[PDB]
Amino acid sequence: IVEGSDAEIGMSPWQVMLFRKSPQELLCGASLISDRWVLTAAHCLLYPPWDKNFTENDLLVRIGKHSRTRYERNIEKISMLEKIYIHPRYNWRENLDRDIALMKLKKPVAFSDYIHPVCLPDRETAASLLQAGYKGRVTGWGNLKETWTANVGKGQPSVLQVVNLPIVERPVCKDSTRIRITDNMFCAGYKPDEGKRGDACEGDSGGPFVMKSPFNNRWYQMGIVSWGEGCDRDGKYGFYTHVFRLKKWIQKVIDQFG
């Protein structure tokens, strides 16, 4: 997370870490939507152009973590994957359309003060909240900046990072890039005139874009960290999987297999 701050403990009890088995390394972020269901981006598991094809036993999910490195014994839970469900029309070849993936845990995880699921938006919440200029919140242990000298130069957070970024007009989003953006994506960040900065970076993908509803004071996941040409560049934006658009699919997957 670029231009971020450390999260408070429990600030994002639904954040999930995707951990690679060998090499023992961080892959991506994700979110907890149920005691046995985890939501993430499809390019975290499958992206052939960079030779990426991760399968169920290739990784594990660490839920309830605060620190990026420390093994948070007795606070975090480590769960293994029963199955991975990647969207059938996920278009990695073109624009990353439908960049979404569900993951069924083998055994249900037990909620704590540090592990709690997020809500998924209904018809109305999507309409009321996903408007240009409203701000949501993005969290992850991703890099603090695009590039940083190998000496010192920070670069990697010690703990989870959090920013609030404003939803940006679809017409502005389409003019920001030459990638064909779709109904399944929405973009967020500050415009260069706005005199403020922030964005996701490498490692934050798959994590959740959330907004707290002003009506029920609940936290809704409106976006999955999807893609961005760089990190916090001026006149560039981060693009997010528009969760409500693909929610009918999320329902089909869980009503069958869950």
Binding site: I9, G10, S112, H116, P117, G136, P166, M211, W219
Partner: peptide, 30 residues
Amino acid sequence: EADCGLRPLFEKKSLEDKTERELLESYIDG
């Protein structure tokens, strides 16, 4: 499950993380 989106350590404890006010102010103005 029905308790989704209500964090054990803030909402349930009537507590506010250091930044959720920016989110609320964006709904009205500044």
